Short mmCIF file of C-alpha atoms and ligand atoms in Angstrom, two decimals:
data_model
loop_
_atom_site.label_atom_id
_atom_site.label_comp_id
_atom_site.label_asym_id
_atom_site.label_seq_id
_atom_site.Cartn_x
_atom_site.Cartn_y
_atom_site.Cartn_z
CA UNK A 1 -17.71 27.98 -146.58
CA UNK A 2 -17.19 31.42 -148.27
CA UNK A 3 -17.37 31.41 -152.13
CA UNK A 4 -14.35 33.25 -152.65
CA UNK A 5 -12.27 34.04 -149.03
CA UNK A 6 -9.94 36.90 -150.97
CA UNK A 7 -9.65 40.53 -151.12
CA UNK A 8 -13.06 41.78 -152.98
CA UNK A 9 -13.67 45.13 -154.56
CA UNK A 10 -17.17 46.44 -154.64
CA UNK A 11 -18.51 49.71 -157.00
CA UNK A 12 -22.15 49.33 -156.45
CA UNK A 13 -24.28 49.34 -153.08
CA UNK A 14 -26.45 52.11 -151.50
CA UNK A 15 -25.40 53.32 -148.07
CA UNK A 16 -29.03 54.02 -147.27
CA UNK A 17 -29.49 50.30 -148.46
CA UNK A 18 -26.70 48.97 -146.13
CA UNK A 19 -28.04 50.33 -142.53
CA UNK A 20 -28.24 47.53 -139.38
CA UNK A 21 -31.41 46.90 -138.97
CA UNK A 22 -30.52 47.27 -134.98
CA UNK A 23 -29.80 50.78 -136.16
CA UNK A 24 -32.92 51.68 -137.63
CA UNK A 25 -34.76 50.47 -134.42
CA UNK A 26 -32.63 52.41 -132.27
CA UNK A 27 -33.20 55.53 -134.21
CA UNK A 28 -36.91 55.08 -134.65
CA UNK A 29 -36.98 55.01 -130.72
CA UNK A 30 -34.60 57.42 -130.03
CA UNK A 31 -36.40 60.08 -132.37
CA UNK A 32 -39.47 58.34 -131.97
CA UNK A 33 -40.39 58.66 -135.47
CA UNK A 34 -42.80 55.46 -136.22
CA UNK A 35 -41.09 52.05 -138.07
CA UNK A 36 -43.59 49.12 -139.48
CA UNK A 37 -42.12 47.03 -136.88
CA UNK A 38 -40.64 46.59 -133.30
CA UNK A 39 -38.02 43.85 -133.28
CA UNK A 40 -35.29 43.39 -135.73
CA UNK A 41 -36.83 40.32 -136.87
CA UNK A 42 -40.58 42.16 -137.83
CA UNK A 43 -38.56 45.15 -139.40
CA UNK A 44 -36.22 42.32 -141.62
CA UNK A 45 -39.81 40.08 -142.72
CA UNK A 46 -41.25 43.82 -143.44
CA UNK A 47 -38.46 45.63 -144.67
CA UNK A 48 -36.96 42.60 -146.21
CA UNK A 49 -38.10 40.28 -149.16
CA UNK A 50 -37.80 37.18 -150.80
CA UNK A 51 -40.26 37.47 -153.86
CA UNK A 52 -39.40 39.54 -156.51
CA UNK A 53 -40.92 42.87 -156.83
CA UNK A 54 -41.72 45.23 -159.38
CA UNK A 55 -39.15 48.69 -159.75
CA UNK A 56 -41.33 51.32 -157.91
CA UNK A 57 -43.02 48.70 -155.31
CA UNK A 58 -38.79 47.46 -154.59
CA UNK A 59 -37.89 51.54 -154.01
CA UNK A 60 -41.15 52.29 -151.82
CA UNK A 61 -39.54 49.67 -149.08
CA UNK A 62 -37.16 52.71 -148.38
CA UNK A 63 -40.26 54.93 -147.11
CA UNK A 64 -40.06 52.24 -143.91
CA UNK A 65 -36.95 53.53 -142.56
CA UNK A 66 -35.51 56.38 -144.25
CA UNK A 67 -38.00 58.90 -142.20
CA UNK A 68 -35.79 57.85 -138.91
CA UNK A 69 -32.32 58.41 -140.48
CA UNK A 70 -32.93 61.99 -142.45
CA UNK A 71 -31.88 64.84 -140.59
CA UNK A 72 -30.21 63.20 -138.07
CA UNK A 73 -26.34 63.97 -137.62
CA UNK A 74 -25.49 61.23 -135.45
CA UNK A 75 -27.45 58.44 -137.32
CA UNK A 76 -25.77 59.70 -140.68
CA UNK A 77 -22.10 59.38 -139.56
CA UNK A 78 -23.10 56.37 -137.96
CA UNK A 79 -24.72 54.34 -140.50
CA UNK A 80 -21.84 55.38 -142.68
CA UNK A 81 -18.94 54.44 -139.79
CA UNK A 82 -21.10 50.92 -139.43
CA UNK A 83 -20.86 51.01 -143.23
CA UNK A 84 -17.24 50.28 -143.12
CA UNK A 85 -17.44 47.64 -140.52
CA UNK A 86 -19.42 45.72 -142.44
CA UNK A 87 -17.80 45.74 -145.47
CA UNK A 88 -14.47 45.36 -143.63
CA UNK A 89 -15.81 42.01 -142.53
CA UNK A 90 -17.01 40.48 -145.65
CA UNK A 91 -13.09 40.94 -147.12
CA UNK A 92 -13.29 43.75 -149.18
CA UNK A 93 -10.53 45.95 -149.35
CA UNK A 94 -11.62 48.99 -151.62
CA UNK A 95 -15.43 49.61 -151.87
CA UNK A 96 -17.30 53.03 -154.16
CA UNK A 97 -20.84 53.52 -152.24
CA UNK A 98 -23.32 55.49 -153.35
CA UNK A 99 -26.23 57.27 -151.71
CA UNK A 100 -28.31 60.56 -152.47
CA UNK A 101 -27.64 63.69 -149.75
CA UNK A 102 -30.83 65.51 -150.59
CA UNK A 103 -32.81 61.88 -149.49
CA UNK A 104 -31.31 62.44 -146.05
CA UNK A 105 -30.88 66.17 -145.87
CA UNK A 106 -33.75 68.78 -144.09
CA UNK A 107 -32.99 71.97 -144.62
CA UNK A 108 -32.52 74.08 -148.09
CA UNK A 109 -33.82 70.71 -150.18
CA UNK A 110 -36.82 71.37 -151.68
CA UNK A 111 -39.51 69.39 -152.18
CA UNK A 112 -38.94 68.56 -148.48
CA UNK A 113 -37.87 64.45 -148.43
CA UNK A 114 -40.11 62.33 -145.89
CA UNK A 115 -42.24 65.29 -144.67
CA UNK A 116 -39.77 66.62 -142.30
CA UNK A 117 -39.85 69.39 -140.34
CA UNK A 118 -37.32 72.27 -141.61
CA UNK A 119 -34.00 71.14 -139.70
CA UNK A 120 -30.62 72.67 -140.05
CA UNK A 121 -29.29 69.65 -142.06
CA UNK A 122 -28.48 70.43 -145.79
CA UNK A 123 -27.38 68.63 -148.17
CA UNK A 124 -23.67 70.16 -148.18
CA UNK A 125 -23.64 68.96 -144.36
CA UNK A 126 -24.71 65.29 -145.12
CA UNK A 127 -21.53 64.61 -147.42
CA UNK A 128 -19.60 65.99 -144.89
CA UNK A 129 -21.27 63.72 -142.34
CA UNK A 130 -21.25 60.72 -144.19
CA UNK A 131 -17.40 61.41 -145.33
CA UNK A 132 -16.47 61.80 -141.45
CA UNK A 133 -17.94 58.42 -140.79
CA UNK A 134 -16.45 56.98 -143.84
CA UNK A 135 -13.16 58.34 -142.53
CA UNK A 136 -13.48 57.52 -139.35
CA UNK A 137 -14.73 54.11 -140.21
CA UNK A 138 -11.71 53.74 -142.20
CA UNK A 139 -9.23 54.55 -139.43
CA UNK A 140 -10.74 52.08 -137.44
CA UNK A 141 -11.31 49.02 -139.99
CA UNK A 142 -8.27 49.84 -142.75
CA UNK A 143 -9.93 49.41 -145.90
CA UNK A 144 -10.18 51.93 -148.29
CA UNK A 145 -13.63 53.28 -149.02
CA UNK A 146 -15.33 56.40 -151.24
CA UNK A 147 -18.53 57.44 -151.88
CA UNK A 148 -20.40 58.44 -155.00
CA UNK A 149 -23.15 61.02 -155.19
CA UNK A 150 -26.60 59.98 -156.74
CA UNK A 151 -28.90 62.40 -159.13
CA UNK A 152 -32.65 61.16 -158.55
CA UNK A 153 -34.30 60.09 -161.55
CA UNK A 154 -37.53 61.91 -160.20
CA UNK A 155 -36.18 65.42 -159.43
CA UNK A 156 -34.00 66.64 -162.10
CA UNK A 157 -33.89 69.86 -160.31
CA UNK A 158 -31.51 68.42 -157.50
CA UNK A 159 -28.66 67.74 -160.17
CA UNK A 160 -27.09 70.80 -160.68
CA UNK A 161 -26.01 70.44 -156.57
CA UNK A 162 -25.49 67.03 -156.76
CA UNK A 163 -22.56 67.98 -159.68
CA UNK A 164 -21.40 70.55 -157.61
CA UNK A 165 -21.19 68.62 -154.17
CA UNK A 166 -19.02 66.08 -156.58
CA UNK A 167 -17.06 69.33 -157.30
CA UNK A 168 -16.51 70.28 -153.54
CA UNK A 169 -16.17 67.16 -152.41
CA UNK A 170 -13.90 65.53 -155.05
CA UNK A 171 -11.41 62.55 -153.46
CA UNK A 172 -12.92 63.37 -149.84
CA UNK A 173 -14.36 61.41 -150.29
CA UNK A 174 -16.74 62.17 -152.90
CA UNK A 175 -14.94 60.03 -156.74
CA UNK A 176 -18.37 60.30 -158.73
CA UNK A 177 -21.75 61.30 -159.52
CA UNK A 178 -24.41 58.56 -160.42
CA UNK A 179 -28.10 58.83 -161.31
CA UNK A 180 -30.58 56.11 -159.83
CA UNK A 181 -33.89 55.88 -158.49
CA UNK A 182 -37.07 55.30 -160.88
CA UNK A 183 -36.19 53.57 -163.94
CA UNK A 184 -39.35 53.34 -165.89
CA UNK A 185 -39.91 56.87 -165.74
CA UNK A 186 -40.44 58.06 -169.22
CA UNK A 187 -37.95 59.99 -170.93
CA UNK A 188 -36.03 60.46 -166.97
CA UNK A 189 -32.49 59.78 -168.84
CA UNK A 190 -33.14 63.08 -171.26
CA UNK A 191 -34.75 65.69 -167.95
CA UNK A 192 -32.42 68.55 -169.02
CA UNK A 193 -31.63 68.71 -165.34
CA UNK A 194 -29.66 65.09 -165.37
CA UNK A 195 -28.62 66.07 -169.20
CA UNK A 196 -26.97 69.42 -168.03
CA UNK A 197 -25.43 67.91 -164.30
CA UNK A 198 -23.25 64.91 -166.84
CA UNK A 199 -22.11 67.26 -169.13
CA UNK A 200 -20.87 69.66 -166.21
CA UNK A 201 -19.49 66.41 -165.01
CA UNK A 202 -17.54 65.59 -168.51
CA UNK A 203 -16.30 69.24 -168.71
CA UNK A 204 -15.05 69.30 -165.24
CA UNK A 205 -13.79 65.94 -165.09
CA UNK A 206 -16.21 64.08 -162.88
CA UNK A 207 -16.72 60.88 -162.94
CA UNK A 208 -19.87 59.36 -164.32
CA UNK A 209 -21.90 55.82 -163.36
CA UNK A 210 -25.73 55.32 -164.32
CA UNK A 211 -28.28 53.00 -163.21
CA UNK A 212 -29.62 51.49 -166.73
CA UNK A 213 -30.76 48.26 -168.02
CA UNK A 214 -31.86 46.87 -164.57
CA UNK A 215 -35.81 47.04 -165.74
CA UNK A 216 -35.80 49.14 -168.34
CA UNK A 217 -35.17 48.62 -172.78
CA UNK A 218 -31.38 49.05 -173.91
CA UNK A 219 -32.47 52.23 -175.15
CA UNK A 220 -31.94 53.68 -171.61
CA UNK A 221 -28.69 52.59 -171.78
CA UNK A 222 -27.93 53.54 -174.98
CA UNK A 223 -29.01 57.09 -173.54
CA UNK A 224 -26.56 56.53 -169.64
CA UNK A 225 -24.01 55.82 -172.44
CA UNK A 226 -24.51 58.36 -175.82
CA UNK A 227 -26.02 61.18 -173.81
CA UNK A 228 -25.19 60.87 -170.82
CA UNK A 229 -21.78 59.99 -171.16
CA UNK A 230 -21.57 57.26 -168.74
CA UNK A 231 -18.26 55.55 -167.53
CA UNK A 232 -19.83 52.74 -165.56
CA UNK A 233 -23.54 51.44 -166.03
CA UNK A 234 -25.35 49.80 -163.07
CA UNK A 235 -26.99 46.59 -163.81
CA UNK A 236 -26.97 46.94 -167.74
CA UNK A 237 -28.30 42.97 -168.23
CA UNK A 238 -30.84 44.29 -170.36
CA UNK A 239 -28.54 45.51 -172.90
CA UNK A 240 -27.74 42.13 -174.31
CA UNK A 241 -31.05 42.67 -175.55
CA UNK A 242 -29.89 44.87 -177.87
CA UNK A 243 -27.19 42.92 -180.23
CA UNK A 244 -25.09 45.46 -181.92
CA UNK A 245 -25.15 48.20 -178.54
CA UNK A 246 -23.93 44.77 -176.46
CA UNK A 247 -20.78 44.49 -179.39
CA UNK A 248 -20.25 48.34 -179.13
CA UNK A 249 -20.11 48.28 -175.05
CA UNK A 250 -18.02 44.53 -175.18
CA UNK A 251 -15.67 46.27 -177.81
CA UNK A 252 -15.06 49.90 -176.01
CA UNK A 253 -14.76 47.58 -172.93
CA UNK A 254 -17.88 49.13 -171.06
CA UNK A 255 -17.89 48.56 -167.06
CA UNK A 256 -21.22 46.88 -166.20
CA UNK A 257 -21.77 47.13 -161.89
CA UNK A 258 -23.15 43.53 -162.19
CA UNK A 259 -25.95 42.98 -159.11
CA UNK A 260 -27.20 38.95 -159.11
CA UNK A 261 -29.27 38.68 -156.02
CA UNK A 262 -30.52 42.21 -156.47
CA UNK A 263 -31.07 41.19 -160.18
CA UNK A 264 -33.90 38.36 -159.00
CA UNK A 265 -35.79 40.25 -156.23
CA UNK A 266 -36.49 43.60 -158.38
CA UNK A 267 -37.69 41.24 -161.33
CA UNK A 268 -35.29 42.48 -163.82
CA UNK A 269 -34.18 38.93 -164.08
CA UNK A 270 -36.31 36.20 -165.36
CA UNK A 271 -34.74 33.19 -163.15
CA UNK A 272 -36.04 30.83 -166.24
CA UNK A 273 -34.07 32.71 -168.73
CA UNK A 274 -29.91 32.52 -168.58
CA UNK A 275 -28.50 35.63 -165.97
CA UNK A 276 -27.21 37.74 -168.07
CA UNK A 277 -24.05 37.91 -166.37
CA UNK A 278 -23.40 34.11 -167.51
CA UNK A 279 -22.51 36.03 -170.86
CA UNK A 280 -20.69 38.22 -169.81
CA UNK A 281 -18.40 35.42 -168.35
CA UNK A 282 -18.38 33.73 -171.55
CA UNK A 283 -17.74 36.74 -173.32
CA UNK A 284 -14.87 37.74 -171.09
CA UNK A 285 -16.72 41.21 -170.55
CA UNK A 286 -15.87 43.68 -167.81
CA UNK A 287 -18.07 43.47 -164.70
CA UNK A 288 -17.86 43.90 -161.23
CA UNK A 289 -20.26 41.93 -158.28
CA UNK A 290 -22.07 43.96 -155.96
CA UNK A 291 -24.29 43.79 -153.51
CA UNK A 292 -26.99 46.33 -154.35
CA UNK A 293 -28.72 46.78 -151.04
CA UNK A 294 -27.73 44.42 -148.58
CA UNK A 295 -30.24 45.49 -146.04
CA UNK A 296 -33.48 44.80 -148.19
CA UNK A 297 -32.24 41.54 -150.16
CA UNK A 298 -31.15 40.36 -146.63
CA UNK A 299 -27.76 40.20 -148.20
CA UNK A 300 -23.98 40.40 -147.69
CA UNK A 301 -21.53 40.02 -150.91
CA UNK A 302 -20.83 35.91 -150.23
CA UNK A 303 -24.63 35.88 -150.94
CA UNK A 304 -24.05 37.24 -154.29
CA UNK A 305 -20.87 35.02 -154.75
CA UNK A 306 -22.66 31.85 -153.47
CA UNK A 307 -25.16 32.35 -155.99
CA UNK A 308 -22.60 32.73 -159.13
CA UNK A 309 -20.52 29.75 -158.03
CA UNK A 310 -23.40 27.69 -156.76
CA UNK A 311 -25.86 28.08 -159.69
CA UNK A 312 -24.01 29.65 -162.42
CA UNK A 313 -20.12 27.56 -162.35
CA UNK A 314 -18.21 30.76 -161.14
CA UNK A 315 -14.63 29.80 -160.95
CA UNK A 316 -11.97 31.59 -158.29
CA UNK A 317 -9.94 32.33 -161.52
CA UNK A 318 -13.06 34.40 -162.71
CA UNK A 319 -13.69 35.93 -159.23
CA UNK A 320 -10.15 36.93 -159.27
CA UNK A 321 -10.50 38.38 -162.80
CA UNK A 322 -13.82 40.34 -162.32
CA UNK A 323 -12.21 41.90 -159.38
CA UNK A 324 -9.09 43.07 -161.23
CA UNK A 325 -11.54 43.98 -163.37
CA UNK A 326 -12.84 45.88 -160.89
CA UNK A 327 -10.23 47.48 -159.64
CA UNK A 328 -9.22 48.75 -163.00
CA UNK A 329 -12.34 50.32 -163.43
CA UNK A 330 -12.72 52.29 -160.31
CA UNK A 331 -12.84 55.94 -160.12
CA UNK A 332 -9.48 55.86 -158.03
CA UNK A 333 -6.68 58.70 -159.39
CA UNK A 334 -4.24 56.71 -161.06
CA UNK A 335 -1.67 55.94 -158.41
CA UNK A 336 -4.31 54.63 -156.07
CA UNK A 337 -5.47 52.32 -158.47
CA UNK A 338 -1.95 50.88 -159.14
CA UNK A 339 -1.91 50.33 -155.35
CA UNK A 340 -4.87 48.50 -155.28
CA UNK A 341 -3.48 46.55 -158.75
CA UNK A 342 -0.70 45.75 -156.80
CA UNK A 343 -2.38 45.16 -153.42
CA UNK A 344 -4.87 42.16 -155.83
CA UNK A 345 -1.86 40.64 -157.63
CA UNK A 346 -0.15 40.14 -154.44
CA UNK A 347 -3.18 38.68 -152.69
CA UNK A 348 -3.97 36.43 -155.64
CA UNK A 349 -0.76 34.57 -155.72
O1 LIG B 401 -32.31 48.92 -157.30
C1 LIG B 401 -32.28 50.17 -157.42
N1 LIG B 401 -32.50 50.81 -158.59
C2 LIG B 401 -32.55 52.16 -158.72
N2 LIG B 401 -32.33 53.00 -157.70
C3 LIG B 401 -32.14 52.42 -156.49
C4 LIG B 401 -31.77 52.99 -155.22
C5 LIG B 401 -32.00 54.42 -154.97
O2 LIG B 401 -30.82 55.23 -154.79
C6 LIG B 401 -31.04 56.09 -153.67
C7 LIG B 401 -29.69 56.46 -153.04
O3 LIG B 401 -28.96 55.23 -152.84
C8 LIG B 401 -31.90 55.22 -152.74
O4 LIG B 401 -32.57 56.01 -151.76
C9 LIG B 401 -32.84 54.52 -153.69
O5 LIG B 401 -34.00 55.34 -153.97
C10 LIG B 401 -31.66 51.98 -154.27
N3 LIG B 401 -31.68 50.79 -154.94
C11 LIG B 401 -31.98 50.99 -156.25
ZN1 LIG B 402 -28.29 50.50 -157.26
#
């Protein structure tokens, strides 16, 4: 039985961590670029985990597959077009997701991702191609879906574009810019590349998420938030580490993109401490659940609500109120988030 069988809103999962794993196999072949496996079920065991990881040895799992999906036009709009579907079936009815278009681009993105041949794929054509499968998925499914553009915490030097693809791109389908990737590397937050690309993004009114607190001290998201500028913050558990930044954040009503099952397997979550996000249900904060990537945590978002109910006492009043929640916090222009308002209050009667 489904945790929580009601319209769902999700802010936080990775395209290129939501691909069928049928998908990646057919690519591999059809390319025939090599995969670690042969069947779906070898890629999933391989791919896949169910032991917790370390940051970096989590984000090398993408090195598997991504090779067979960069640079290809048809496997872009496709993943993204299957992207919908899935999401479509697991009840969600307005979903933000997030990938980076220089990690799947081949031509003028330098260093070259995933040792690919110069192609005539760059990254202004994969947000096009992943917005036409959005759309198109869309059309096909009816629920509402945008994307959000990811900085790198690795290659500052991308994030100038990245601001500027959020520029071009802005509503279609393109509502915000995000930085992820490598947590623990030093000093990433402060690369006057990311710096610069969030202050464009403040001055030009472009919305602003961060990846901080998933492994990393509060001070990294004392930097998505002071620096940065930061509207959202992915993960953030660590923060509550930090007493008086956890008051500041519960007081100016921060969003925290709240991740359980991805929370375990990437061991930012000690599962003999208390899940952070059991305080911020206590403390009535604002969070959202997400499934982070779906495709490595063998995932789908009842996983993540199974787990809150299940282990954690998750109540369908506080499903319903992290979703408003939700909702209220997505980077939506104002009368599309009153439709979705309205859209949740209807559904939740
Ligand atoms: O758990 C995570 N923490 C930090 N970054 C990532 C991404 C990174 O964002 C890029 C675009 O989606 C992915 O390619 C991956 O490197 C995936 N999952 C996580
Ligand atoms: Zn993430």
């Amino acid at each position: 039985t489904p945790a929580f069988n009601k319209p769902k809103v999700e802010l936080h999962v990775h395209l290129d961590g939501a691909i069928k794993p049928e998908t990646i196999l057919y690519f591999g072949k059809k390319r025939g670029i090599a995969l670690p496996a042969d069947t779906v079920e070898e890629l999933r065991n391989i791919i896949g985990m169910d032991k917790p990881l370390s940051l970096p040895g989590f984000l090398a799992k993408f090195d598997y597959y991504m090779p067979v999906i960069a640079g290809c036009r048809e496997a872009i709009k496709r993943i993204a077009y299957e992207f919908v579907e899935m999401k479509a079936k697991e009840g969600v009815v307005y979903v933000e997701v997030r990938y980076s278009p220089h990690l799947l681009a081949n031509s003028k993105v330098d260093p070259m991702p995933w040792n690919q041949t110069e192609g005539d794929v760059t990254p202004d054509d994969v947000v096009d191609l992943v917005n036409q499968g959005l759309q198109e998925g869309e059309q096909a499914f009816g629920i509402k879906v945008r994307s959000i553009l990811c900085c790198m915490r690795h290659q500052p030097s991308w994030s100038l574009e990245v601001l500027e693809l959020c520029k071009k791109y802005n509503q279609k389908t393109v509502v915000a810019m995000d930085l992820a990737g490598d947590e623990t590397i030093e000093g990433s937050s402060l690369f006057p590349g990311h710096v610069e690309a969030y202050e464009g993004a403040v001055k030009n009114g472009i919305h602003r998420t961060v990846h901080a607190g998933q492994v990393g001290s509060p001070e990294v998201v004392r930097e998505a938030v002071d620096i940065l500028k930061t509207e959202r913050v992915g993960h953030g558990e660590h923060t509550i580490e930090d007493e008086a930044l956890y008051n500041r954040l519960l007081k100016e009503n921060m969003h925290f993109e709240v991740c359980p099952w991805s929370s375990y397997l990437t061991g930012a979550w000690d599962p003999k401490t208390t899940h952070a996000v059991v305080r911020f249900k206590n403390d009535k904060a604002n969070y959202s659940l997400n499934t982070d990537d779906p495709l490595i945590f063998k995932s789908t978002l009842d996983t993540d609500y199974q787990m809150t109910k299940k282990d954690m006492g998750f109540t369908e009043e506080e499903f319903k109120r992290l979703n408003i929640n939700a909702a209220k916090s997505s980077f939506l222009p104002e009368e599309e988030k009153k439709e979705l308002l309205e859209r949740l209050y209807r559904e939740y009667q």
